[PDB]
Amino acid sequence: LSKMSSLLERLHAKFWSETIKLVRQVMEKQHLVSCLETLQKALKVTSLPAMTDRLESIARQNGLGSHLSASGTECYITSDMFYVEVHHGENPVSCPELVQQLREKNFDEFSKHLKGLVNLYNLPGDNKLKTKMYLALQSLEQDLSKMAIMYWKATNAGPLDKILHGSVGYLTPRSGGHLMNLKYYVSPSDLLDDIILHENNVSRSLGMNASVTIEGTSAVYKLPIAPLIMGSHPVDNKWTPSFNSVDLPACFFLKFPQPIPVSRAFVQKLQNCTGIPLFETQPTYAPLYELITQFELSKDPDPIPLNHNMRFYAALPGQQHCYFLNKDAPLPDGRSLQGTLVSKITFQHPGRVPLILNLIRHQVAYNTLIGSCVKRTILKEDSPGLLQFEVCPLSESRFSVSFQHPVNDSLVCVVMDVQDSTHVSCKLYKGLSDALICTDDFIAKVVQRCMSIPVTMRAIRRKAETI
């Protein structure tokens, strides 16, 4: 509405050379102009000075020292990184990705890449220890590359065994802003989109990743600057004793983009595996049912909460399922399956990563199996069908679903126990006056091929109805 007022003021003032003379007189004797330039940067006419201004503005937001030597060749200079486009060493590698964003109008991703390179050095070091700290980092990616090389030497199978059931995970080595990431899981539901071929040209977001890198920590730790792996077993990896090494105030961290709901016993077996406490302070433990529901409701964004009230609805082509998670179920230990959320993992030497990632894989498999019942679909108060299902845990990595007999009147319980990342065993409990329903091996194969409770229930219902 200020346009009319501006027009009126302009009309009042419209009733120049004098302004130029006054400015010249001032000239002869801050951030606002930069803000105007960076606001005009988005629509800049494509030309070499325009891209120079765009890059200098990008450096201004990123804090990089904006220094230019020519119109086409520019240098990014900071404490310890130096990149030229047409420190403590030369350019790492002329990766084609950064050229790919630079040659096109993809400067936002270029800015994020620059921020990532800067964030690689968010360390509190004194520019010498920091230097050494990044040198150690190299040693770590060499060690994980050797781990992957050894596992490739173990068997010449596909990357599926590399990701799902194997030491550490699939490698994407660091290049530019993308850190070195490790693939450990893909769900069968996520595997098939709308049958996806898993050739070497796999995307980075196809599933979930597990990055490993260094952040400063409050404690001082002994870390190897030199590569730790020099000798390789035929099929194993052995880590040589450290100390070169020195007490560097940092730690190696494995970063997860999103938190995973993990049980308490997983936490203590994690400190059993590693020894470094995950949480600085004791957090509040809650049953992981609400945690998993909030986690896997985020895979399908919606600003409006569903108001599920622990009564979850599932839509199938022939069946409609009403689910009751039945939280706070009475376990033999006297408590429920308490759980928390994990986002960061701490470790000391590269010999800890395989067991940690195996336990993470097992927990993710169990969580996905439990959360397959979790759906946003609503088919409310439908009188036909609407089978009632109740989930009740029994022990760690164990649970059971109890439901009415599909044909008879007694109850029937099916108990699931997860053995490994892709190993799940199944048992059946039925009354004395009943008929044959299914076999345990069939249920185990269905779980191993789909990893979803509603699909398993559908298969059992169909096989029992066919009899």
Binding site: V33, E37, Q40, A50
Partner: protein
């Protein structure tokens, strides 16, 4: 017009009236090029075109029916 903003702010950062001279030059091109401007509006210009299409086509079948009629026995 954005390049005008770019080079005037570059000149202000480094060090004129030629910018306003070429802006008035853009004005004289737009005054020359507003003869071909949409004076009669978008709907009328397009409709006029279809009206002339109807006129021309009707002239065509009347003339061809006059030439094609066979009065003689």
């Amino acid at each position: 017009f954005l390049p005008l903003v770019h080079n005037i702010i570059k000149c202000m950062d480094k060090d004129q009236d030629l910018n306003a001279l070429k802006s008035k030059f853009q004005e004289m091109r737009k005054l020359i090029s507003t003869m071909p401007g949409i004076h009669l509006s978008p709907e009328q210009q397009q409709q006029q075109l279809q009206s002339l299409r109807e006129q021309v086509r009707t002239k065509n079948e009347l003339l061809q029916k006059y030439k094609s009629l066979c009065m003689f026995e």
